[PDB]
Short mmCIF file of C-alpha atoms in Angstrom, two decimals:
data_model
loop_
_atom_site.label_atom_id
_atom_site.label_comp_id
_atom_site.label_asym_id
_atom_site.label_seq_id
_atom_site.Cartn_x
_atom_site.Cartn_y
_atom_site.Cartn_z
CA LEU P 115 113.89 137.38 68.57
CA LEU P 116 112.89 135.17 71.49
CA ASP P 117 109.55 137.00 72.21
CA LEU P 118 110.19 137.68 75.90
CA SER P 119 109.81 140.98 77.86
CA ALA P 120 112.65 143.15 76.55
CA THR P 121 114.18 143.59 79.93
CA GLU P 122 112.37 142.27 82.97
CA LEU P 123 111.59 138.69 81.99
CA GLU P 124 115.15 138.51 80.60
CA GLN P 125 117.08 139.52 83.70
CA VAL P 126 114.60 137.47 85.81
CA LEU P 127 115.72 134.12 84.39
CA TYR P 128 119.09 135.07 82.96
CA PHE P 129 121.07 135.05 86.17
CA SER P 130 118.55 133.69 88.69
CA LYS P 131 117.22 130.15 89.24
CA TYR P 132 114.00 131.15 87.55
CA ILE P 133 112.59 128.24 85.48
CA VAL P 134 111.74 129.03 81.85
CA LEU P 135 108.74 127.30 80.36
CA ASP P 136 110.21 126.08 77.07
CA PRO P 137 108.70 122.88 75.39
CA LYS P 138 105.84 120.81 77.11
CA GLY P 139 103.30 121.36 79.81
CA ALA P 140 99.53 121.18 79.99
CA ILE P 141 98.76 121.29 83.67
CA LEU P 142 97.89 124.79 84.91
CA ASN P 143 97.69 127.21 87.85
CA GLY P 144 94.39 128.79 86.74
CA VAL P 145 95.22 129.37 83.07
CA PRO P 146 96.33 126.97 80.23
CA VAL P 147 99.99 126.04 79.94
CA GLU P 148 102.34 128.86 78.88
CA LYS P 149 103.91 128.37 75.55
CA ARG P 150 106.74 130.80 76.06
CA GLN P 151 105.86 132.48 79.45
CA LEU P 152 108.52 131.97 82.11
CA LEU P 153 106.95 131.76 85.55
CA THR P 154 109.42 132.56 88.36
CA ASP P 155 110.77 129.67 90.33
CA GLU P 156 108.31 130.56 93.16
CA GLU P 157 105.46 129.87 90.78
CA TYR P 158 107.37 126.81 89.55
CA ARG P 159 107.92 125.01 92.82
CA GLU P 160 104.36 125.89 93.85
CA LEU P 161 103.05 123.73 90.88
CA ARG P 162 104.02 120.24 92.13
CA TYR P 163 103.32 120.71 95.79
CA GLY P 164 100.95 123.54 94.99
CA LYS P 165 98.36 122.27 97.50
CA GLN P 166 100.31 119.73 99.60
CA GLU P 167 100.67 121.37 103.05
CA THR P 168 100.09 119.92 106.54
CA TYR P 169 98.20 122.34 108.81
CA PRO P 170 98.53 121.13 112.42
CA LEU P 171 95.66 121.70 114.81
CA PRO P 172 95.62 122.46 118.55
CA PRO P 173 93.62 119.92 120.75
CA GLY P 174 89.96 120.74 121.23
CA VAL P 175 89.63 122.64 118.03
CA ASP P 176 87.37 120.53 115.85
CA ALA P 177 87.25 121.51 112.16
CA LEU P 178 85.15 123.24 109.50
CA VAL P 179 85.55 120.45 106.99
CA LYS P 180 84.59 116.76 107.17
CA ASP P 181 87.47 114.70 105.77
CA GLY P 182 87.75 114.62 101.92
CA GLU P 183 86.34 117.99 100.93
CA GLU P 184 87.18 120.71 98.38
CA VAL P 185 88.78 123.82 99.90
CA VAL P 186 89.42 127.38 98.59
CA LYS P 187 92.69 129.28 98.69
CA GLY P 188 92.26 131.08 101.98
CA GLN P 189 89.19 129.21 103.14
CA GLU P 190 89.23 128.67 106.85
CA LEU P 191 90.01 124.91 107.15
CA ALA P 192 89.63 125.07 110.95
CA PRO P 193 88.66 127.52 113.71
CA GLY P 194 92.37 128.33 114.10
CA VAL P 195 93.95 127.53 110.74
CA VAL P 196 93.54 129.37 107.45
CA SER P 197 94.69 127.30 104.47
CA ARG P 198 96.92 128.89 101.86
CA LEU P 199 95.83 126.82 98.83
CA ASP P 200 92.79 125.38 97.09
CA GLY P 201 92.21 121.72 96.26
CA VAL P 202 90.56 119.17 98.45
CA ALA P 203 90.73 118.65 102.25
CA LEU P 204 91.75 115.56 104.24
CA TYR P 205 91.90 114.46 107.87
CA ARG P 206 94.67 112.98 109.96
CA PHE P 207 93.84 111.34 113.26
CA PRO P 208 90.58 111.01 115.21
CA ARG P 209 89.98 112.28 118.74
CA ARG P 210 86.18 112.49 118.72
CA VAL P 211 83.23 110.52 117.12
CA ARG P 212 79.98 112.38 117.46
CA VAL P 213 77.06 110.78 115.63
CA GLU P 214 73.52 109.34 116.09
CA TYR P 215 73.46 105.98 117.91
CA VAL P 216 69.99 104.56 118.84
CA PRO K 342 74.75 110.60 119.33
CA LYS K 343 77.28 109.36 121.90
CA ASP K 344 80.71 110.91 121.08
CA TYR K 345 83.05 108.45 122.79
CA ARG K 346 86.46 110.05 123.34
CA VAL K 347 88.93 108.09 121.25
CA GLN K 348 92.52 108.54 122.60
CA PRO K 349 95.14 109.03 119.81
CA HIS K 350 96.94 105.79 120.83
CA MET K 351 93.90 103.98 119.38
CA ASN K 352 93.49 103.33 115.66
CA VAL K 353 90.30 104.06 113.82
CA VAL K 354 89.46 102.24 110.52
CA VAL K 355 86.29 104.22 109.71
CA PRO K 356 85.68 106.55 106.78
CA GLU K 357 83.60 109.77 107.34
CA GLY K 358 79.89 109.17 106.86
CA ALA K 359 80.14 105.48 107.05
CA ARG K 360 77.59 102.88 108.06
CA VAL K 361 77.73 100.97 111.35
CA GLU K 362 75.29 98.82 113.33
CA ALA K 363 75.62 97.38 116.92
CA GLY K 364 78.12 94.67 115.87
CA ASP K 365 80.86 96.46 113.94
CA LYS K 366 83.86 97.82 115.94
CA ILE K 367 84.56 101.47 115.13
CA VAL K 368 87.66 102.64 117.04
CA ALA K 369 89.73 99.51 116.59
CA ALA K 370 92.60 100.43 118.96
CA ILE K 371 96.09 99.06 118.35
CA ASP K 372 95.64 97.56 121.76
CA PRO K 373 92.98 94.85 122.09
CA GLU K 374 90.44 94.68 124.90
CA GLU K 375 88.21 97.65 125.99
CA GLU K 376 88.27 98.81 122.31
CA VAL K 377 84.90 100.45 121.48
CA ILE K 378 82.26 98.24 119.85
CA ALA K 379 79.45 99.42 117.61
CA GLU K 380 77.11 101.39 119.82
CA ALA K 381 73.61 100.89 118.31
CA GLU K 382 72.93 101.84 114.74
CA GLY K 383 73.57 104.68 112.32
CA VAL K 384 76.25 106.63 110.45
CA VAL K 385 79.71 107.58 111.77
CA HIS K 386 81.52 111.00 111.97
CA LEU K 387 85.06 112.27 112.86
CA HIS K 388 85.93 115.32 114.94
CA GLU K 389 89.10 117.34 115.80
CA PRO K 390 91.88 115.94 113.55
CA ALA K 391 95.48 116.66 114.55
CA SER K 392 96.22 117.85 111.00
CA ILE K 393 93.88 119.13 108.31
CA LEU K 394 95.99 118.95 105.12
CA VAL K 395 94.89 119.80 101.61
CA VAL K 396 96.18 118.09 98.41
CA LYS K 397 96.25 118.99 94.63
CA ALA K 398 94.61 115.67 93.92
CA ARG K 399 91.02 115.10 92.81
CA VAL K 400 88.72 112.48 94.30
CA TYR K 401 87.59 109.51 92.31
CA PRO K 402 85.83 106.82 94.36
CA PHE K 403 85.24 103.24 93.13
CA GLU K 404 83.31 100.16 94.25
CA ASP K 405 85.33 97.50 92.33
CA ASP K 406 87.97 97.00 89.76
CA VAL K 407 91.42 98.61 90.21
CA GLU K 408 93.33 98.67 86.89
CA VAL K 409 95.37 101.79 87.38
CA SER K 410 98.24 101.10 89.79
CA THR K 411 100.37 103.66 91.73
CA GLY K 412 102.72 106.25 90.30
CA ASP K 413 101.62 106.76 86.65
CA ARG K 414 100.65 109.97 84.86
CA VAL K 415 97.03 109.31 83.80
CA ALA K 416 95.85 111.60 80.98
CA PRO K 417 92.51 113.42 81.45
CA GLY K 418 90.19 110.59 80.36
CA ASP K 419 92.33 107.49 80.94
CA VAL K 420 90.24 104.97 82.82
CA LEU K 421 91.23 104.72 86.53
CA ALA K 422 88.85 102.24 88.12
CA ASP K 423 85.29 100.90 88.15
CA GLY K 424 85.89 99.17 84.75
CA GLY K 425 85.20 102.24 82.57
CA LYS K 426 83.03 104.56 84.65
CA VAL K 427 85.91 106.24 86.46
CA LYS K 428 88.46 108.29 84.47
CA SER K 429 91.05 110.99 85.25
CA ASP K 430 90.72 114.72 84.60
CA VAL K 431 94.44 115.57 84.97
CA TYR K 432 97.87 113.94 84.66
CA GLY K 433 100.16 113.17 87.62
CA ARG K 434 100.86 110.42 90.19
CA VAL K 435 97.97 108.14 91.04
CA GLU K 436 97.86 107.02 94.68
CA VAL K 437 95.43 104.13 95.05
CA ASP K 438 93.79 104.05 98.55
CA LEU K 439 92.15 100.64 99.10
CA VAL K 440 91.48 101.69 102.73
CA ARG K 441 89.09 104.50 101.89
CA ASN K 442 88.04 102.78 98.65
CA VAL K 443 89.02 105.71 96.43
CA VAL K 444 91.69 106.28 93.77
CA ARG K 445 93.00 109.85 93.50
CA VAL K 446 95.65 111.59 91.27
CA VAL K 447 97.84 114.53 92.16
CA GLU K 448 98.04 117.27 89.47
CA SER K 449 101.51 116.95 87.90
CA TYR K 450 103.32 116.62 84.65
CA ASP K 451 106.74 116.05 82.94
CA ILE K 452 107.19 119.70 82.08
CA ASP K 453 110.56 120.58 80.49
CA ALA K 454 112.27 123.28 82.64
CA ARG K 455 115.60 125.06 82.68
CA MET K 456 117.48 127.95 84.17
CA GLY K 457 120.29 130.31 83.24
CA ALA K 458 121.72 130.59 79.77
CA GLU K 459 121.54 126.97 78.84
CA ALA K 460 117.86 127.56 79.25
CA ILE K 461 117.77 130.27 76.59
CA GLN K 462 120.25 128.63 74.25
CA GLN K 463 118.10 125.68 73.50
CA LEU K 464 115.08 127.97 73.00
CA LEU K 465 117.29 129.83 70.48
CA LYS K 466 118.19 126.72 68.56
CA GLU K 467 114.48 125.65 68.58
CA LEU K 468 113.53 128.93 67.01
CA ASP K 469 112.62 128.36 63.44
CA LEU K 470 113.71 131.51 61.60
CA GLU K 471 111.39 130.49 58.71
CA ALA K 472 107.90 130.12 60.16
CA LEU K 473 108.31 133.28 62.23
CA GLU K 474 109.15 135.22 59.12
CA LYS K 475 105.73 134.37 57.57
CA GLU K 476 103.84 134.77 60.83
CA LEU K 477 105.24 138.26 61.27
CA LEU K 478 104.99 138.96 57.61
CA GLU K 479 101.21 138.73 58.25
CA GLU K 480 101.29 140.23 61.82
CA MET K 481 102.92 143.35 60.24
CA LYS K 482 100.13 144.10 57.76
CA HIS K 483 96.83 142.67 58.88
CA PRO K 484 96.95 144.04 62.49
CA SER K 485 96.67 147.75 63.25
CA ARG K 486 99.18 150.15 64.81
CA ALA K 487 99.22 147.99 67.97
CA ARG K 488 100.98 144.94 66.61
CA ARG K 489 102.45 146.64 63.59
CA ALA K 490 105.26 148.41 65.49
CA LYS K 491 105.94 144.99 67.09
CA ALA K 492 106.42 142.91 63.96
CA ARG K 493 108.09 145.99 62.46
CA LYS K 494 111.33 145.86 64.52
CA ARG K 495 110.78 142.19 65.12
CA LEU K 496 110.90 140.74 61.57
CA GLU K 497 114.03 142.70 60.72
CA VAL K 498 116.10 140.84 63.34
CA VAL K 499 115.39 137.28 62.13
CA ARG K 500 115.57 138.56 58.57
CA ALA K 501 119.06 139.67 59.38
CA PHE K 502 120.09 136.33 60.94
CA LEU K 503 118.84 134.50 57.84
CA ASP K 504 120.86 136.47 55.22
CA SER K 505 123.97 136.10 57.35
CA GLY K 506 124.75 132.44 57.75
CA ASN K 507 124.75 132.58 61.51
CA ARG K 508 122.09 130.79 63.55
CA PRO K 509 120.95 132.62 66.67
CA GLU K 510 122.29 129.75 68.85
CA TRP K 511 125.82 131.24 68.40
CA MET K 512 124.68 134.22 70.57
#
């Protein structure tokens, strides 16, 4: 009746804390909002913060990205850090300022 | 290009790829005195941040006019800044950043979301026995053997609930 996978998708959200995607939604994760599809809670929580992670850097390890700059899921943000999500990149604090000064 | 080692206990109010000439302080330390001045002319860069963090926002710069405040779900097209030349492409919280002169918006929405059996129950109540009957009444015939077997066993169920007097919500 409720067009879900006869077994898997049922048990998945029937007992567990797995969020069903009933009414609303438009924002995606690579594909248009799911009308009746019930992404697991993993996929749920990774929708709000689904790009909001601080990646600390050791001292003396510059970067591979200059401040505000689009990153890929797995794109090496730094020479020692591999990001785990897409979106844009950002900086934190400045320890070096190398640039042309006549 | 003189690097100038800025110690972390010194603030820096300079955006990446900014414009500075021999009179504009760059690393404006929290502490006054000795703080670096503009060394000659040219652009400005930033190296070795303590944290490179990504965000699910999108970048929308502006030169003037800030009409969209902070914390509101702006629909893909709703004018953010610059009078009418800057619009959003996704909903979610707008964090205006007057410091970098750019208004961004994190990708979020008021998606209705539930768990357990209370999750299913509402989706059962919401199920219109009627529309589905027609939809499957066509999905049974017009499609081939692929969807036929689907609508086959499917339609019978709702058909049963109809001629019974019991809404599926009682399940």
